[model samples]
Target chain A: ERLWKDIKRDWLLYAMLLPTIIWFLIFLYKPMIGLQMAFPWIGFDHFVTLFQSEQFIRAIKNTLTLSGLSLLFGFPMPILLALMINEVYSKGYRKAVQTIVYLPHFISIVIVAGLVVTFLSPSTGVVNNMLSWIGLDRVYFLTQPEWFRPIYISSNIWKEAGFDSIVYLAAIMSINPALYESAQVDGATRWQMITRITLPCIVPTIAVLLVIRLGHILEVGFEYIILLYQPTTYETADVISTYIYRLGLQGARYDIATAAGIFNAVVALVIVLFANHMSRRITK
Target chain B: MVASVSIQNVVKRYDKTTVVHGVSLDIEPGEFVVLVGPSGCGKSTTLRMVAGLEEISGGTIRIDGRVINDLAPKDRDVAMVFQNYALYPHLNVRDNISFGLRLKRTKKSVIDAAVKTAADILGLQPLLERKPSDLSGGQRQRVAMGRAIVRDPKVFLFDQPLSNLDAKLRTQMRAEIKRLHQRLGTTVIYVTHDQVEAMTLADRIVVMRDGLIEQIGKPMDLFLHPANTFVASFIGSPPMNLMPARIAVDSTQHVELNGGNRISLLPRAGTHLAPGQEVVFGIRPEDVTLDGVEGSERAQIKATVDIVEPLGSESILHATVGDHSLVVKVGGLNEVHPGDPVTLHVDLTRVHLFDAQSQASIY
Candidate 1:
């Protein structure tokens, strides 16, 4: 009765929040039944004993490697870009920079991967042509095991840095002008104003974002990696999501795939929980 | 050490529309001058110009006789306490105070000493380590003040610093700022719209209106002798009552109100010489009393009390004398209800007679 009264009283606010609640219930909570299939029996008997598969361990290792490398390489690049963009003086130049950089975030993953393939293609690609013009041999990027992780990390960084910079830019905009004025009165140049006032005021926002990102360190995107990866590059690029999809739906090894999916979920939950706990201890 | 500030015929215009029109004022070393007026009266703009935050469109600003018109705000050596305090939210009180010193590349010891000295003066020792988010409003305001004091600049500019506090805190900080000025003895140019702030803290007050200086004098001078009708109307609470009048009879002294009240003045007393000219009759509310004739020049009028408002300390009796409404402040403790017969006594000697033609005081 109280809940109904609250909803009636705050009907407009409830209406605004209703879509997210219904979305999570439909798309997230309704899928929990599939998670219980991980405890499978032998030969798919009684849907238990998926734990005995060895391929699941290999998938777990691959997912952890891919997600960890992506987090380490991609996390701080946007922060650096945000700080650089904040110093951009001319409005026209700044707008131009933002337009060019933020355009990648809206590009579809298929087109982005296709663009990467067009440039990195071994035969008659722009990059290969440039390399041959420079008298260096053309090397296949997507198919090379050693080069796969770096390309994946760098490409994703370009795709997301401008989008993530929006938050830090907002944080920088809110710093008190008096702080800059105070610094200027003390003989601080523009560089000092940025370092002392702009950077310090946004540290809280950065810390909160860093903590949230730490929680998701092992959830690298599945679609782009799948499109870019070949069997030769599986050792470096085969994450758990791709491995599970391949094994369960295509390879028909549902038992093995279910164990691998459950293991990934458990590890991710522990990491996120630990990160949240650490964040609470230091700040809020 | 403080520097004298001089603004010589300063004019500020935005988009070809003049806001400050040739305002010139001088502040001696260690003098506290407050530029006060209503909102949009260009008081804050004048202060900002002095602080090097706003450019002067027409005139020159000098600090200790050095032309500082083109100097940056930092080079000008002026510290401003903003209306919002504008403290860095992420910094603690001590850091806020020492932030400027640290930017100067001052020695760490020097910065610590400056912060400690300011903290001692403001009694902010306990809050030195607390961020602004943790401090009370009054504490935050004091921390902002402490930040300015630590800089020890040549001039101090305050832009309605106490206007953001609650009533009690506002009054308290008013006294605190006065005490700070007394201790520091630095040249200060404060901007506020509050008349009480202008009266209480200023050694000399400059009242402005529509970006023009209405009057400049000691607080008592402005209260006792306002230059024109605008200053007369702007200075006091409930303001000065200005009624239109016409000169009566053969002499230039006697004047007749439009509503059938005649008053006498001295003959050869003013600049103009005309018998039947219209002028504004002016008197302060507090100067009008409930007593009978007290002096030879005293005038009495019969009126019915319209409304009586008792203000604890005194009772304000609003009465209708003829077609005009006048207020008489009385100290009688007894409650006087509305629509009662009341006799209002006007002291003609203390009364101000203004030239209706010019609105200038006619001695």
Candidate 2:
């Protein structure tokens, strides 16, 4: 009764907030209610089939490994690139470097995958030709399961490092110019200033970006993996999303796929909640 | 320790435009010198050149007889307090004060002792753990001062440090800065556009205009014996009143004004004037009073008050003498109003005469 009275008093504000609530209820909460298939364990049927599948276990392991590797290699590239670009004194040169680095992010994923295939071609690729010129044998880079993780992580860094640095660079620029002058007068070397001043000033920005990235850890980009992987490479490259796609859409095993989907979401939610708590503590 | 500075024709230029034009001055050790002028008068630029922040386009600046022309700001051993109190927002007061010492790789114990000393001197002991954002404007300014004091540099440079404070706070900090100078006895160069700051804080004030030095003298000397019309008008609060007049061709060299009024000069000691010469007659507002001395040859001018600005203890009266405007300072309690005729005595002994053509002082 009290809640209804409060809502009536703020009816205009509630009216203004209504559309977003309705949108989320219809699109997000309605689909969330379909998780009943994953919990058929009340009658004890669908979850049993999910745990018995060997492919589901393998897919879970693959997803964690691939996404963890990407996080390790790809997280710090943008920060390093932004610092390096900031040290460049010429405005024209910095702008040109920025244009070159972020240009690949605008390219379509299919086109980027096609370019990756052409470059990693065994016989007639530029990389192999360079290797041969340096007195090495032509190596089959794409067909090897060990090379998939490195290729995927490096490609991710190359495409997104420059674009991701935009926010960090904005954070760096918001620092007062007077602080830099004071540091210079205090006899600080440029490297000392960066470590003592610049790095500490931007830690909040870095933490917020880290928290968001951690939320997406298990949801690694699957489009590039599906395009680049073969049957042999699936040993390392086949992740949860690809497995769910093949099983649900192609093989029409809806129940087991729904179970796997629900499992992925629960893990993502747990990781996101933990990361947010840690972020709050560190910022405080 | 204090250092003597000798600036030899220092010049500052930005690309094609020059801001400071070959300014030269010598500052003795432990003396406080102020560079004062209006905005864009190159006073701050000159101070920055001495601090080694702005590169000198020509000539050299010597500190304790050592040429610092090629040295970086850190190598020059001079500390500066910026107008905005450039305290590091991220660091607490203690860390901010000790930042320069730590950069020099001083030992931890020594840095701690120095920071404590600065904090004690600036009365920042209680606020040493607080960030700059948590402190008031005056506290932030003290932290900036602490940052400079901890280093114990040979020279201290302040660039309009009190310009950001309120009137009452500025006055309070002004006394504090003067007290600090007495305690430290360091050679100091302060820059401000405020004449009161220059008058109260400087051992010698350098007045500048249009990228050139107009005069360099003691504040009282600048006020009494100004070099020209600009310095005469720029130094005092109620500026000196100047009126164009012609000398009558007579033995007494009586002055003639626009409205056919004549006043005899009392033969000032240093004046070199002749009959039939065009000159400017100048007198301070304080030198004009309502009471006239008996049997004195000083001119008694009659005028009606135009505007009275009561300033609590004293009032500034704008009046017209023979159709020429003049401002007179009088006691605030005097019951005077607009359109009231008043007899004002101009002190001829303290009068200033200037050459009309050159605008330079005659005596």
Candidate 3:
């Protein structure tokens, strides 16, 4: 009776919340029924075919390496960048560097790919030219299967590191300045302050962002991957989304594509669940 | 370890605006000195300057007679307890206390012992493994103090460390801090806007206003003989009531209140006074007694009680006397009520007189 009374009293609030719940149920939940079209558990042959395909295995391998290494390298890059930017006391220089680095996020992936290829063109590129000046071999970066993952991961970090650091920087800002002053009075050097104060202070934020990042481990930047990859570099560069694109849309194999996508989501869902579990233990 | 801190005309400015303007003080070794004032009165800036957390824009600060003008905060060998407690929320009490020792690469066993001592002193042994987020406000404050004390620095600076604590805890922590200082005797420079804390904790108090020291003296001395009206009101609770008046002397020296009440005053030696000179008459809340004392030194005024605040053993009467609002502290058992007329007798010797223009004390 009390619950009913509460509902009646807060009926306007419930009315306001009704649309979001209805929207989620209809637009979000209803779409999950379509996932059955690719539930290969119902079709043993299709599942076996997917598991047996060399291309499918290669795409899986490529996706994991690209995503896992990016997670390892890219996840810490923003944190380190934010910390580095925090240490530079020159406000103008910090602002300039921040602006320059964050400019990449606004650039289209195609433009970024063009810039990357231009910078590593082997013969006429800036990177190879620098490598030549440094007395190194000028190898083709875009086409080589061995060179693809490094170029892709490094480029992705360079492009997104600063923009992503905004979250961590804001978290750092909310921290009490008293902590920094206290650390200093405790005979802490600036490096010690960063290690003991700034990094440790932003862990909860790092944990939450990291948990969110792991869920997207299966979804590599397929748009950038497609623009960068060719048949020659498909061994190292072809991720699941791009593979699915070639298999399903272009090759008119919707059933197999649907199954591949479902498999990808399931992996993401499990990893996200695991991430939340690990995240919970770290902070909560 | 203890060190005397000497701030010699230290000034702090940001661009065109100055926050602390040429403030100077000499704190004795093993002394508990509190810098006190109203909000944004630069008391915290003065403490921060001594801690080396802020740049002294004008003069040098010396610790044990060593000039620390160009030294980093780390090299100054000082530790500060901050207003918000500033306990590293990520770490437990043990880690927070031992952070400095670990940073300096002290031996693990030595660090452990130091942490244990600070924890034991702060009564935080059971909470040694607990993070700051898990602790209460008072516990977190104790943890912050433990972190500073574990370092065994030459000087300890506090920036209103008890401000975040509730009244009950503030008093408890205030005494605990006093006890801690009594035991260790490390030179402490505490800053607070609370005069009650200043009165209870400080060996000597530095009263500040407009980024400058108004007066520096022992708590009771400042209470009894404030150098100016600011110190007179700021260093005591239920502050000294000051009202505009004129110095009048037909037969003897006396100041007439705005409400036409003439309170007799014995002018302090070297004070020059004449008839019609503007002055502010001051009297403490406690100095005003309700019932008339049979003495010539007592002067009476009629006032209507506006409100009564009973504090168990004592009651405060907020009353009005001839367009002047007065807060009088009376002993318990006074059945005072609103709109009731009563007589207030102020001790003649206890009254304070300040030059209305200069705001400096005349007596």
Candidate 4:
């Protein structure tokens, strides 16, 4: 009732935020009906099946590994790139660099994968030609099982580094110029000011970004994996998303896929909630 | 604690737009020198040059006999107290005070001792753990000074430190700064547009105009013997009155005004006049006394009081003598009102005669 009163008093503010709240509700929370299949036990009956599958347990392990690797390598690229971009004194040049880097993010995933294939193609690719120039054998980089993770993470960085840096740059800009002058007066050089003032001032923003990023970890897309992977690379590259697509949608194992999806969401929710709590504590 | 500073013809230009032209001044060891003028007069720029924040385009600034033109601010060994009290917003007062020391890799014990001493000196013991945002403005200003105190540098540079405070607090901080300067005996250069602050705090005030040093002298020296008309009008409240005058060939000088009546006076040719050359007469409000005589030869000049302002300490009578509206500070608070007739005794000794064209003093 009190909240309703507050809503009435600040109706315009609430109205401004309504579309975002509606988006979260529809896109984020409305898909929970599939979780029912995760708990139902099925025999050879015509009912959804779960909790008794060897494949489901394996899928869990694969999903966790892929998410863990993504979290480790995908997170720091934007931060490092942002720190470099911050030092670029000429705003026009910074804008030019940012535009070039961020343009790749707008390329369709199919196009991105096609470009990657052209660059990483074993014999005809430019990468192999460079290696051949260096007196090395034409290594099949994309086909090789060992190279997929690095390629995936680095491509992710290339696509998103510029876009992600915008938040951090804005955060750093919001810090008062007086703080920088104070640092200078304290005998801190431009380098020291960057490390001490610029970096620390944006810490809370970084923390919040981390919390938001952790929430979506389990929902890694399968398009890149499907486009790039071969039958031989399935040992490492068959993450839960690819597995769900092949098993539930192709092999008619709906119950198992539904259960896996629910598990992925629960784990993601737990991680995100934990990170949010940690962020709040650290900021305070 | 004594640090001598000499700024020799410093200029600051940015992309062909010269904001601060060649300005020069010197400060004796342990002297609290104030750079004062209106905004955009480059007083702050001059101070920044001394602090080694702004690069010198033309000349050298020497501190403690060492040329600091090539030195970084840290190497120059000067502590600056900024107008906003530029305390590290994230750090508490104690940490802010100790930041320079820590940056210099001072011993932890020494940093702690310095912080403690500064906090004690500033009476910031209770607020030492508070951030700048949490402290009051006066407290923040003290914290800024405390940070300077902790550095114990060869000189202290204050960039209009009390300007952000209210009038009462500004007065309080002005005294506090004077006391700090006295105790530390460090060469301090303060910048301000406030004449009162310049007068009260400075051992010598450097008045600047358009990026040039107009005059450099003790506060009273600037007040009594101004170097130019700008200084004369700039320093005093109810500024010195000036009126046009002309010297005649017959060896008598008379004021030139719209009114036909002119008093013939014996002119000292070298000190007061040049034949047929027009000039202006300058005198302070307090120099005019109530002679209270009607048409007396040596003592009388007719004036009708237009308005009388009672300023507690003295009564200022606004009146008209000839065609000039003037203010006279009388001996005591007068029951004098508007439309009342008064005679003013002009003390020729205290009178300032100036060349009207140049606005420079003739006598």
Model 4 misplaced regions, further than 4 Å: A1-60, A89-103, A106-108, A189-191, A220-223, A238-262, B237-357
Candidate 3 Cα errors over 4 Å, as ranges = A1-7, A38-42, A117-141, A282-284, B248-251, B266-271, B294-299, B333-336
lDDT of each: 0.79, 0.84, 0.84, 0.77
Q: For each candidate, give its TM-score against the true structure.
A: 0.87, 0.85, 0.92, 0.80
lDDT of candidate 2 over A110-206, digit per residue (tens) = 8888888898898888888899998898878889887888888888887878999878888888887667777787778888988888878888898
Candidate 3, residue B153: how far the Cα is off, in Å: 2.8
Q: Candidate 2 chain B: minimum summed lDDT over ten consecutive residues — where?
A: B291-300
- At residue A119, give the lDDT of candidate 4: 89
| lDDT tens digits, residue span B95-189, model 2 | 88888788876489999888889988999999988898789899999999999888788899899999989999999999999999999999999
Q: How many clashes in each candidate?
A: 7, 0, 0, 0
Candidate achieving higher DockQ, 2 or 3: 3
Better of 1 and 3 by TM-score: 3
C-alpha lDDT (0 to 100) for residue A280 of candidate 4: 94
Cα lDDT tens digits for candidate 1, A1-284: 99989978989997989999999988998677766645424434422444444554565677777767766778778877888898899789999999998889999889889988898988767998899988898898888988887777788888988988889988887766766655665667877876777777777787789777866665686888778888888777777788778888889877667766776678778887887787667655
Error in Å for residue A79 of model 3: 1.3
lDDT of 1 by residue, B1-363 (tens): 688988999999987899999899988898999999889988999988887777889899899967889998877878888887567876778888887777766489988888888999999999988888888898988888887888788999999988878888888889988998888899999998888888899999999999898889999999888888878888776778777767768545566775566666654444464677667778777777764455435345556888888886887778776677777777755556778876666666666667766867765
TM-score of each model's B chain? Answer: 0.93, 0.95, 0.94, 0.89
lDDT of 4 by residue, B76-186 (tens): 888888887577666778887787787876489988888888888889999977887688899988988887888888888999898889999999989988887777788
Model 2: residues with Cα > 4 Å off, grouped in runs? A1-52, A241-262, B238-266, B273-309, B316-329, B333-357
Q: Please give the lDDT score for candidate 2.
A: 0.84
Local accuracy of candidate 4 as per-residue lDDT tens digits, A1-284 = 99989989989998989999899888876655445544346633322344455555565566677788877878877777787887798789988998997787888777877888898887798988888888887877777878877778788777777788878878887776666665676678777787766876778788889888888776664788878887666666777677777877888877656666666667778999899998898774
